[PDB]
Structure formats: C-alpha cells, structure tokens
C-alpha cells in the first residue's frame, strides 16, 4: 500500500548545535527524510512533529497537501513559528517519500527543473571561523584573517560571500548580536562603535575579495529602523549585493528600504503567503528570503509564485546540514524567480559521515543532483556515532 | 528519451461551437491531451499554440514550468488573453503527458488529492435548452419550461443550478447578452424590462427548484456598476448562492460587492496572480472563478494558493467538453479552498463518442477518476467523424 | 535572596484534555504558579518552557520584563504561537511569585484594582454538555436540552451565555468545527444545513434564556468571509451580544464587520500589540479578546492599553482550570476598558480537588479575591492523583 | 454605397521578421490600409483579424467606433494582447479608408494637426547594426563601432538616439535580452557583468554623440525592480533622456521611478485607458509610450487625452515599416502632449519598393505629409516580390 507506517525523529551533534531529522516510512519500505532545526530560536519543533506524526500514520504518503490542510486545521490557533516548522519538516519528508515512490528527484514534483546549476553565496563568511573556530578553521581573530578569508573565497571561485556584524577594536574579536541577546542590550541601539567596526570589517573583506566577488551584509534583527538607517548612511558608498534585515514591522522595513542605496533582503523567518504579504504590499524588499526548511518546500513554491507576481526574486535560507542543502537545491531548481542560493562552505569535520551524498560545487555554483528524492539520506549508524 | 516529439492541434464540431484539442507526443509514445476553446471570445488560440509548440519540440516533457517560463518570455509584450490561453492549453497537455509517464492521475502532480468527490452545480440551466434547443433538449420556450427544468435538476439530485438573463415578455423567449453584442446596445443599461424579466425567470426557477436546490445567477459582462446595483436591489430578497459579474474594474466591482446582499463571484476571464490581485486587494469578490483551461492547471494552483491567503474560495470555469471536465476535476481534487465546481449536465448527442471516458456523477457530486493523466482521452477517429 | 532557583512543569488529567502548570520557586521558598494549555492547537509549549526556564534560574524573580525581553531575543525568529505561549506561562508564574514576595494580590502589580467584581458570561453553553457529556452533565442531546440549559443559566442569575455551531437535524447532535477538521472539509463552506441548524439551535437557546439573558455566538475559524456574511445575513434579526470570528485576514474580517448588524469580536489567538495592530487599523472588531494565559498578563496589559486608545474594550479568553480563571480575574480587575469576562460554569467533578481555592460567583459576577498572588494554588498531591 | 466589401491580410519578408498589412475595400473602390506585427511577441494577430473582418463586411466604413464597440463586445473575455492588436489593425485600416473617402489626411479626423513636423529619435541605434547586420549596415561589432554610429547620428542632424543592453567583454558583441529569453535566464538578475557592459557601451555612445545629442536607454522587460534600481544607481551620473522599463507591476515600476535620477518611460505594451490607469495612479512614469499600431489610433487619442489630464506626455511606439511610421506621424501631428516620436533610421534595402511614399526627415524632424489617408500605401506587386 501507499500508507505511512511510521514517523520518527532523530538528532545528532553538530558541534555548537544539533541537527534534527524526520524519518518517514511507507508500507512498501520507502523512507522519506527531512532535516529541521531547533537552534535558531525554535525550541519545541520535535514535540510538534511527534504529535502531528501520530495523526499521519495510516494516511496516504501521496496526499501531502491533505496532511498540510489537516495539520493547519488542528493547530490553527497557534499557527506559525514552531508549530509551522514541525508541519514543514513533515511536509519535506512526505515529498522525499513521494518522489522516491515515483522514482524521481524531488524537483520533478515541483514543476520540473528549469536550471541544472544554482549560483550560491558562501554564507557565514567569516562568521563561522570567528564564532565557532573549534569546528570551522582556520580560526579568524583579526582584520587580517577577515581579509584572508575573502581571498580564499575568491581563489575558490565563489562569486559572493555573506558576513554579519563584528567588533574588532574592543578586545578579542566578537560578534555583535544584541537582537539575539548577545550581548543583552535590548534597545538595539547603533552607535559609533558599531558603525566604525562594520566599516573596518567590510573594508578588510573587500580588500581580500577583490572588486568582482560580491559582498552581502546580514544585520538579522540587530537594530531598529533608526539604527538600520544609520548603518545604511555609514555604508552608503560601499558596493553591497544586499543588506539583510529581519523585521516584524512591514512599515518600518519599508521606510528603511525607501532610504537605502543598497538592495534590501528580508523574510527568512516568515511563514506562508499570509506573513509575506504585508511586506510585499509595503514595497519593503528587493529580495525575499524563503526558509523552505521551516515552511515546507510545497508551501514555499506558493510563496515563490506570490513573489513572482510582485516581480520579487527569492533566495533560500540554507545554513544547516547537507540534507537541508539538497532540499533547497530542489526548490532552487524549479523556481524561475531565483535571486541566488545561500550555502555554508565551512563544514564540520564529520559532516560527510552523516549523509550518503555531499553537495557538489563547481565554479561557484551548486550542481543539482538527479537521484530519487532530495539527493542525500542521513545515515542512521553515523547519527548514533554523534550523540547530541 | 523524455523529449517532446510533436505538438498537434485538432478540432471537431460541437453543434453551435467547436471543440479544440492539443495532442502532445513524447519519444516513448506517451500522448498528452488538453482541450481548449476559441468560441468564448478567443479567436487565434490555435495559431498561438502552433507557433509555441514548434519551440517545445525537442525539450523535456517533464519540464513544464521551464516551458511556461520560456513561453512567457517569448510572448511577454502581448501576454494575457489568447496568447496566455495557448500557453495554458500546452501546459495542460504537458501535465497529462507527465502524469501518464509517471503512471499517476494528474492530481498526483498537484499535491495529491484531498477529496474523492466534488460538489457541482448544473450550469447553463436552463440556458442551453433555451439558447441551443437543436442540441440540448427538451427545448425551453416559456416560464413553465424554466420551472420544469429546475424540477428536473431537483429530481436528479443536483444541489445547485446556474442561469443567465432572459427576456420572456417581449416575443419568443430570448437571452439578454448585450455585453457580448446580443443585442448590440453597447451602453449595457438596465431598465424595467430587464429587471422584471429577471424576477419572473428566477421566480419560476425557484418554484421548480424547491427551497433546497441553490440558484446561481450569472450576469457575465452585461451591465455597468450602476446596472448591477439596480439588479441587486431588485433581487435583494431572493436567495442566491452567488451573483456572478465579470468586470475589468476592480474599483467598480468592489463598489457593487460592498452594496450586495448576495455573494459575488468573478474572475473567470483573468490570467495569473497578477490579474487577480487588484480584485482581491479591493475586496471585490466573495468567490474567485478560475479558468484552468485558459490558465493551465499548474498556473491555476498558484492562483488558488493566492486566493487561499485572502480566505477566498475558488471555483473552476467548466462549460466545454468532457476532457475539460476531467482537467477541472483534477484541479478540484487538490485545492483545499474549493467553493464548488461548474459543469454542464446538458450534453451533445455525440459527446460520449468523442472521448474514451465520461464523467460520473452521484448524488450531485462528480467522482474524481484515478486513471493515469486527466481521466479521459479524445478519440481521433471520432473527432474526424465530426468535422467542424 | 530573590533569585529563581527552579522552574518545573506539571500536568494532570482534565477529562478530554489535560491541564498544565508552571511552578517557579525562589531562594526564599516562595512558589509562583501559572496554568497553560497544549490542547487548543498548541503542541510543544511544555518543551519551550523547559528550555526557557533553564535560562531563568539564577535571575531575579522581580525582573519579569527583563526575562521577557531576553526570551523574546532568544526566540525572535520563531516568535508567536507556542514559543510565545511558553514565555507567557513563565511570565504568569513570575508575576505570582513577585506578588507573593510583596504580599499582595496580583492586581496590585497591575495598577491596582478598579472594580471588585467582574461580570461574566457562561461559556461553552451548552457546548460542554453536548461535546463532553462524560464530564459535564446533564448531557444535552436535542433542542429541548439546549433550551433547558439556557433556562438553567437564567435561573442561576447568569446574564450572558456563549454557544458554538451545532447540527441537530442530521443524526445525533454534533458540533460543526470544520476549521479544526471536525469534520475534515477544509474549504469551510457554509450551506443551508449549517444555516438552518444555527437558527434552530439559537431559537431554542433564546426560548430558554428569556429576553434578558444575552447570547454570544462563537464561530471560531469555521468559515471564510463569504460564509461569515451568509451567517450574519441569516441571523440578521437575532439579538446577539457578539458574533466571534477568528481570522488571520484583517481585511476580510473588517469586510465582514462592516456588513454585520451584530458586534464582532476576535483576536483570542493573537500575540502582542504587533499582531493586534493590523486588525485595529482595519476597524475589524467591536471587541478584542485577549488570551492572557497565552500572552502573559503583563504583556496583556500592554495590549489592553493599545485597545483603549482605539476605544475598543477587551475580554479575557478563559476556558481552562480555576487557576486560569484567577489569573484572568486579576487582569479583569485592573483593566478599565473591560467588555466582559469569559468563564466555564460547567466544571469537572474533581476540579475543586486540584486547587486550594475556587472562584466565587454572585448574581452573575465573579468576585475578585484578595489573597497574595493570583488567588489559588494547584495542589501537587491532587495533580498526581489525576495522571494525564 | 459606403459599405465595407472586403477585409484582407497580406504579409511580406522584412529580413529577420515579416511585415503584415490589413487591406480594406469599400463599395466605391476606396482602399484603406494598416500595418501590424506578429514578431514582437504577438502570434495569432492575423487569425483574429480574419475572424473580425468577416463581421465587418457589409457595415459602414464610416462607423469605426461602432466596429470597435461591437468587436470589444465579441471578444470581451479575452480582450487585450493579440485580440486587441487585431482590433487596432482593423481600426487603422478603417481610418485610412474614411479619410480617403473624405479626401483628407488622417490627422484631419483626429482634431486637425497642431504641428507640421515632429521631432524624432533614431531608435535601435546601434541595436539594428549589431543584431541584424545582414540587413542593416555597416555592421557594428565593437565599442569603436558603437561610437561611430553615434557620430553618424550626430552628423546626420538627429537630436536623439536609443540603444538597448549589450555585452561587449564576453566574446563577440551580443545583446542581453533575458526578458525575451535571449539568453534563457528567467530570474532576470543584474550582475556586475551587465552593469559594466552597460557603462562601457553608453560611454562609447556618448563619446560619439557629443554632449548635444540625447541618449535614450531601453531596458524592455530585462530585469526586476531590484535590478532596475541597480542599473539606475550605476548610471546615476549619466545624462539620459529617458530610461525605458516595461513592467506589469505598477507598484514596482513606481518604486523604481521614485528612486530614479532619470526620466522613466513605459507602457508600450499596454492597451486602452484601463491598462494605463494603474501606472498613472501610481506615479509610475515620466513619459507614456503608446503603441498606436497595436491600439488603433482612435483608441490611442483617448489614451493621449487621459495622459494629458495627468500632465504626462506621450511618445508613439514605432519600429516597423514605412506605413507604421506614417500612421504614427498622423497621431503625432494631432496630440498636444507629445514627448517625441520613435523611428528606425536603419532601413531594409527593399523598404522603399514596398510603399508608394517614404517618410521625409529634415534637421532631425519628420515632415507630416498631407495626402489623403495615412500618407503611404503598400504596393501589392512589391509585397509579392518579397514572400515571407
Ligand atoms: Mg540571515
Ligand atoms: Mg518568525
Ligand atoms: Mg460565467
Ligand atoms: Mg480577460
Ligand atoms: Mg472562542
Ligand atoms: Mg494565532
Ligand atoms: Mg521599447
Ligand atoms: Mg501587454
């Protein structure tokens, strides 16, 4: 039969965080997989999946939009956030299982591919080497290291890199992430210290990158509109591919964009057309970042179509393990209005052990695989060799 | 291989109009079919398809969104209307061929089904018996016939019927379709004659229908906002499932809806999220009618998702041959936010000859088939036995 | 010291659902309590609280807005929903502990009381007797029972009752809750069956209530704007205190209200001023329902002030155990712009065992207690006598 | 009589495309002509005209707005695009025939002329010499050729030239037209390569043009708002007469204009006041380009009046054969709010064979002819000497 027989979750060590997986098995023995995350502000996703998966057992593996519709009904009052992340993770395992059942790559379920390769940017560059040097080396501890990291990206034929906010001139190099309470300074004001350190960091990065490697700047939720404007004025003459600002104020973000000489990207934390809509109605973004790991890829196709009608291109949010990269590769293959795809090029020493296949890059582009499903499977024995 | 080898068009007599078909053949010998129309104000669709199909030969049958994206590029300046109808017809033949290649019904490509049966309304009731009595009988020529037709719908367990505008008290019964120049009276004013004949007709229909069969009223493009308001005021105390008004004025239609005591439906003539958007932004509709035959079903899924975010349910436009009904059945199977499905229950005497399978209704609902593809194929020998 | 030493969660059987509690202990041995829920579409709240509570240990019990600010930072990306419910539950335990530390009732932290008694409505009336007759009797199985339940409310001096949607004429009496997939009919259409059963039910309720007991109607998320309008038209001549409609479409809900002859209430599922704002900007509500159990009472005071500036009165969402009632009583005591307070008068046979104090009603009003903290404590031994 | 007796279509080779013509004959033997196009994304126009022309036979040649009104009715559902192009082509042949019947130039039907000469810009300069060197020479293959072409325009007393997007530094010189799938890169992203090649091309053009010849830049549909902004920022210090951007997003185009230091033109692909209106309401354009060949000149007068009330000047879209130039010359003669007129100065070697009269330019202006009708007639024998 095509019934779902079981929905299980798994977790393994990823150094400074864990990876999580959904494992869905059908009556025929097909196994669909997804990867999800709890580290990025999302405690409780596993608990959601465990409850929702119980309702799925006995249903058709083929009927993923039925599952979505029922799940949305069952959790309507507390929809969004971690509930919606659980639903998305299950969706992504359903899609894998369905594609495997039909012996096709997942992009074959998504309209077919319309490109073979996807341009990427090397994300958390040099953020991972600065923040998690125990896992991603060589460690970066000063402006010369920042420069060398951009040189390495250039040498390795990557066409774009993304950094965050770093303080260089007040002790050991450290990230500035007050929006996530590191440090706890909840007003999120921007001062001369933030501005001059942003400038110093970005100048070093540009010096290493050369003029032909693009630089993206992610500000996450680390200011208010007032402070974002201050940052954009400071950096008015810099060449930036985008400045990324997460906000729950469509009006405030739109004000910021209207005064920006740089492209503004946002939306990586939002769910469904409903949450994206106020931003598009307000002209708040140049680029919409879609987290397909959170939303589910089928739901993400809906969001992509919605963006397309507003002539907005989309970029996947992708900063997890190899399975997330392959999930996003399939989305990226099928979406016409694709800006670029995020990926982390800094990998854990045991990353390749955890998965059957690793993503392949050539000349700054990700090669889209053609195996049934997403293109890689977590390896159960290897997961258990890396307890969280 | 999975290459498209040929794209052909066919045409046959349908009494007072013709049916048209796209026939797409793959290198493996799989044949995908769609049905399209030129009679509903759409001269030139065949010519579009013939040009676009030439570009498709040699491409992958699996890559339908690639074809769509390329076709949109190639025809961008004159997009919409008959160009977009040609693109939609090809899309629908691509989907059939893809589903057949994967040995699944077309709804398996659309998210899977989430219902097995679809409530319908019996459309052009008694419009077809009044306007085309040579083909659909018994002929209706007076108010007693109108009543009897609604009684027949009731007896046959249909839960809803749709009529149009008819003049009963000025000679032989005849339709009032000034928006389509029958008669040519281009101001489209509404007067006492129109209003009293609408009332007389609908009262007869209600008398026959009983209180539990729902009545839909289609006004097409037959007035201006002024006249639609006059009609809604006249019929303020009638129980109507919807009043259907086509308009290229989102502001005017929204004004009409705001003053309507009945649900308003519209949009059957529109293409893509872009054309629907101004109506939804204006709160112009209770129900959005989506013509999936015109748009292509894949594009129609995008429109349905967009409507869903606005909490608007959708209904397919379906008033052609059996293949169009089966196309729409697959769309209807997969869309959560489904209002109801249109179908014509009055059929040509040779309709079943033209197709391998006929739609099946039970207790006022359409049964969704489970054969690979749409669920029915045109029959080439039978097409040629009915030259247009 | 005033440090938090521990944050624990507890759970007990509540018949057809469970109750959940946060237990927070200070270095001085003061215990603060809250009650939270996972049954109303909210799997995962316990998991959130368990993670967040670990961060709270060692912090000052007095610094609740510091905890809130830090928690919001830590979970910013997946804020709202179950994450925000966990934060609210912890807030409410912090407030209890703070008030106990200062030897005052919780309303003393909220601006002081400005009334001594709170008018209530008897909620889920007769919903609980129809849906959960094993726990709340006497069972209601027909229209005569509906009438008798309203008579009982009248006799017992309650001034208002709230019901939901019930189907009486298609087999055994049963609720109509398609928005929560009972039944699974995800389009949420409204038909003659829904409308005539709403009318029959409400007429029976009114017959029992007399003209001086007010009737509230809760539609939850059980239609689309189209269907809500159909319901409001059907019930246009009924005297209703409010019609309650949950929606994630401020534009659609505002359209519905603009065409309503009844007061419209909404918002019970929303978090923070940010989520309420689009509804108020759109003139979408007469009354804003605030779930203080979900939001935290301190955050709910902010929302109440925001509503006050829009001249909108607020009502607590209160349909859980006695501790939730006492939490809401303290909020209700301090808010000037208070519409009314929800409470369930149907109680479990073991409810009073679970808590130290029970709410007291007189002449249709809740008496606001004056004990330190919320006014009642869960009893640990009794919780364990009722395993979930 | 003044009846239309026949409506015929003709087609001839125009090198890399064909020309098409409508030939309308009256009972008195007067022949009215128009020219139309299928190459610019418009397959099917001939088929539309063939159907509509059948309805016209027997009607008065004088009653062109009657024909328009009836045609709009008959094709209302699929209006716009290729249907509307067919209607426009017939309109333009009706106007020619009417003017010839009354022995006046066509501008005498349009309010009379209010100027004798029309300033032009030399369009597709050097686009035609780069893209179609087999037909328009001398071939342009490098930046020096670009410069020399602008020098030639200067020498020949043209006051303005228009170019498109060209890639010079990646192999043989080639156009960048992703919006029309040359190349197929459907996201339409703009990168450093596009930007530096735009700059290099335009700098060469300016070097040749001198400071007193104006340069127009046409971007067609080749980016999204994000990319148009990137282009405008790159070219912020260039002196451009206009930057032309086609868009189906009035909101997105308006955003772009609001951030442009150059005049923005658009609308060449739009039909009727209805399609122009959302752009004008949004302040999306400095200049409205009106395609009178597509719309019909009578309809184009309506659009011009509408633009006039918004204080927007209009420019004809004119890049076809001599008859299109003469059609547009008559429109340009009568419209007060005229920005400038497009024309191609690069002509096919056989162009003058195809028509009775050629347009005359003096000192950068087109001389408006004073012969009955448009001012030139296609020559039937010459059409047949150039089979398509
Ligand atoms: Mg980010
Ligand atoms: Mg979020
Ligand atoms: Mg219709
Ligand atoms: Mg249309
Ligand atoms: Mg409620
Ligand atoms: Mg909610
Ligand atoms: Mg142009
Ligand atoms: Mg167009």
TrEMBL record, chains A, B, C, D:
One of its GO terms (biological process) is peptide metabolic process. Mg(2+) 3 binds at residue 275. Pfam families: MR_MLE_C, MR_MLE_N. Residues 143-263 form the Mandelate racemase/muconate lactonizing enzyme C-terminal domain. 2-oxoglutarate binds at residues 124, 162, 177, 220. InterPro entries: Enolase-like_C_sf, Enolase-like_N, Enolase_C-like, Mandelate_racemase_C, Mandelate_racemase_N_dom. SMART domains: MR_MLE (SM00922). Mg(2+) 1 binds at residues 77, 248, 269. Keywords: Isomerase, Metal-binding. Belongs to the mandelate racemase/muconate lactonizing enzyme family. This is Mandelate racemase/muconate lactonizing enzyme C-terminal domain-containing protein.
């Amino acid at each position: 039969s095509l019934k779902v027989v079981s929905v299980d979750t798994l977790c393994c060590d990823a150094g400074w965080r864990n990876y999580h997986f959904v494992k869905l098995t059908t009556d025929e023995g097909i196994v669909g997989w997804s990867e999800f995350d709890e580290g990025f502000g999302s405690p409780g996703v596993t608990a959601v999946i465990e409850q929702l998966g119980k309702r799925l057992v006995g249903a058709s593996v083929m009927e993923h939009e039925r599952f979505f519709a029922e799940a949305y009904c069952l959790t309507r009052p507390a929809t969004g956030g971690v509930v919606s992340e659980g639903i998305g993770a299950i969706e992504n395992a359903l899609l894998d299982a369905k594609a495997k059942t039909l012996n096709v790559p997942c992009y074959e379920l998504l309209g077919g591919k319309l490109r073979d390769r996807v341009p990427v940017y090397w994300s958390h560059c040099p953020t991972w080497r600065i923040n998690h040097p125990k896992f991603f080396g060589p460690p970066v501890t000063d402006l010369d290291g920042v420069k060398r990291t951009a040189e390495e990206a250039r040498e390795r034929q990557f066409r774009a890199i993304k950094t965050n906010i770093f303080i260089h001139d007040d002790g050991p190099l450290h990230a500035w992430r007050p929006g996530f309470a590191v440090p706890f300074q909840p007003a999120l004001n921007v001062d001369r210290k933030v501005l001059r350190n942003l400038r110093a960091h970005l100048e070093a990065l540009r010096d290493g990158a050369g003029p032909d490697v693009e630089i993206l700047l992610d500000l996450n939720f680390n200011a208010k509109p007032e402070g974002y404007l201050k940052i954009l004025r400071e950096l008015a003459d810099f060449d930036l591919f985008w400045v990324e600002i997460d906000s729950y104020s469509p009006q405030g973000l739109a004000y910021v964009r209207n005064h920006s000489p740089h492209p503004i990207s946002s939306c990586e934390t939002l769910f469904g057309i409903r949450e994206f809509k106020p931003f598009f109605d307000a002209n708040a973004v140049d680029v919409a970042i879609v987290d397909t790991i959170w939303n589910g890829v089928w739901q993400s196709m809906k969001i992509a179509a919605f963006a397309d009608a507003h002539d907005i291109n989309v970029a996947p949010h992708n900063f997890y393990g190899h399975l997330c990269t392959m999930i996003n590769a399939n989305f990226a293959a099928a979406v016409p209005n694709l800006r670029i795809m995020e990926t982390d090029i800094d990998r854990l020493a045991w990353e390749d052990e955890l998965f059957t296949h690793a993503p392949e890059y050539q000349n700054g582009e990700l090669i889209i695989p053609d195996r049934p499903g997403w293109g890689t499977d977590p390896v159960e024995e290897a997961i258990l060799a890396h307890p969280p």
